[PDB]
């Protein structure tokens, strides 16, 4: 198809960037790379957690790190006992000063990476696909939504006669670029090949 | 100076200070045919001036910059009668309907990826 990156649209209206910090052509490359390294380890060790956004401010080229969680469990009952360890990795990779700031999403499971990673994990334990997605679609509407639309891949069982699981639900426009829509990507993995996971949730307006 | 005019037409914008004095066109210490070579251009911008007859009775300085050759003269033509809608507001109608405070919007359009020009695309054959 001919497609357009969905949250790639609403940059500057209400959607931020993840590398916002001024810089020059020499270090543009370098600092970009530098962030993403540390992100890889992060998400995997914070897959005991449902994570929600990550952004960098470089306030003095001494980083910031404003990782988001949706569980507050990261910082309660391992209050810094945890977080230190993460900051430690930060220091290890980034040879400039290393500091960490943790934010919270009170939304538990709905919108952005939260329905992303959630629905992936289910496929990867081979929870009933048909019924699985259906429960995750009533859920997000319980907690309220103006409509959510997941789309996953077909070719179940490795073969194809047409049985691709689709989902639209609710109302999910994309004409108005000021009625603001969430989107994340994530991918499941199966022992017959990768399945796409793409979540398009309609909460928002400016 | 006692009447000013903008007029920005074909990417050239031209200052106009219409001064008290006498018919003459002084533009960058010269004339038209002196700030440029042979011109068709010179006649065209005198067209509003004979339209009801002026420039025998006031003096003007013009400082056009950038854009075209015709584009410069575009700017001259535009700003003089954006300073002669304010010298006369009776010919307000007779300048907008005579298309001299009308901005030309036929401006050069940009190139695209996969196209040679603004609309041009490759030829195909096989013989």
């Amino acid at each position: 198809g001919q497609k357009v990156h969905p949250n790639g649209i609403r940059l500057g209206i209400v959607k931020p960037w993840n590398s916002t910090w001024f810089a020059n052509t020499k270090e543009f490359a370098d600092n970009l790379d530098s962030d993403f390294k540390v992100r890889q380890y992060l998400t995997k060790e914070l897959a005991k957690a449902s994570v929600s956004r990550i952004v960098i401010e470089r306030p003095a080229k001494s980083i910031r790190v404003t990782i988001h969680t949706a569980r507050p469990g990261i910082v309660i009952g391992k209050k810094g006992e945890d977080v230190e360890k993460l900051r430690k990795v930060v220091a290890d990779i980034a040879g400039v000063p290393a500091q960490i700031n943790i934010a919270e999403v009170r939304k538990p499971e709905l919108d952005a990476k939260l329905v992303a990673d959630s629905i992936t994990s289910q496929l990867e334990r081979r929870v009933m696909f048909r019924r699985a997605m259906k429960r995750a679609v009533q859920n997000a509407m319980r907690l309220g939504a103006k409509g959510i639309k997941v789309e996953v891949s077909g070719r179940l069982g490795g073969a194809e006669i047409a049985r691709t699981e689709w989902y639209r639900e609710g109302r999910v426009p994309l004409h108005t670029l000021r009625a603001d829509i969430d989107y994340n990507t994530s991918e499941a993995h199966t022992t017959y090949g990768v399945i796409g996971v793409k979540v398009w949730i309609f909460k928002g307006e400016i | 100076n006692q009447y000013y005019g903008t007029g920005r037409r074909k990417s050239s914008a031209a200052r106009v200070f219409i001064k008290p004095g006498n018919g003459k066109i002084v533009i960058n210490q010269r004339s038209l045919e002196q700030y440029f070579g042979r011109e068709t251009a010179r006649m065209v911008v005198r067209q509003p001036l004979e339209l009801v007859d002026m420039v025998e009775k006031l003096d003007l300085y013009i400082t056009v910059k950038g854009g075209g050759i015709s584009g410069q003269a575009g700017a001259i033509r535009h700003g003089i009668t954006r300073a002669l809608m304010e010298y006369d507001e009776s010919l307000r109608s007779e300048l907008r309907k005579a298309g001299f405070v009308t901005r030309d919007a036929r401006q050069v359009e940009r190139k695209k990826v996969g196209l040679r020009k603004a609309r041009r695309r490759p030829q195909f054959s096989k013989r």
Binding site: - | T40, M43, V44, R106
Partner: protein, 150 residues
């Protein structure tokens, strides 16, 4: 189509006061450019002026509005039978077409310069050396003698 489509109006030649003269520079347009075109216009104009102290403008006008095009063949439905309909040309478009042709005719007369062409060429008014006489013998030959209808 469903709209009559034209475009912006060109300006009349400003140092002889004549739209026809300006539309004939356009005909001669060389490099995409009116400039190097206007030279030769004016060069051959003078040639004509010398031989013709009176207007040398009525040797364009007569020649080309003697020639009155009328022929093509189309078809339309009428009463439930289509018929092969011959169609007349409207008197305005006759004009519009005709002015061009004579000046189109240059750059093939195998001269050195467009002086010697357009000069000797244009001067004639009904005894043309231009395409105007050469289309006469086809337009009226055809029409109403091998054309079954208006």
């Amino acid at each position: 189509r469903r709209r009559v489509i034209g475009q912006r109006k060109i300006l009349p030649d400003p140092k002889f006061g004549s739209e026809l003269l300006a539309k004939f520079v356009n005909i001669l347009m060389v490099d995409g450019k009116k400039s190097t075109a206007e030279s030769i216009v004016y060069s051959a104009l003078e040639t004509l002026a010398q031989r013709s102290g009176k207007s040398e403008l009525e040797a364009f006008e007569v020649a080309l509005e003697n020639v009155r095009p009328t022929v093509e063949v189309k078809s339309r439905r009428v009463g439930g039978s289509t018929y092969q309909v011959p169609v007349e040309v409207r008197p305005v478009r006759r004009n519009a077409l005709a002015m061009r042709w004579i000046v189109e005719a240059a750059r093939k007369r195998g001269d050195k310069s467009m002086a010697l062409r357009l000069a000797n060429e244009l001067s004639d008014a009904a005894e043309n050396k231009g395409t105007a006489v050469k289309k006469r013998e086809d337009v009226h030959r055809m029409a109403e003698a091998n054309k079954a209808f208006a």
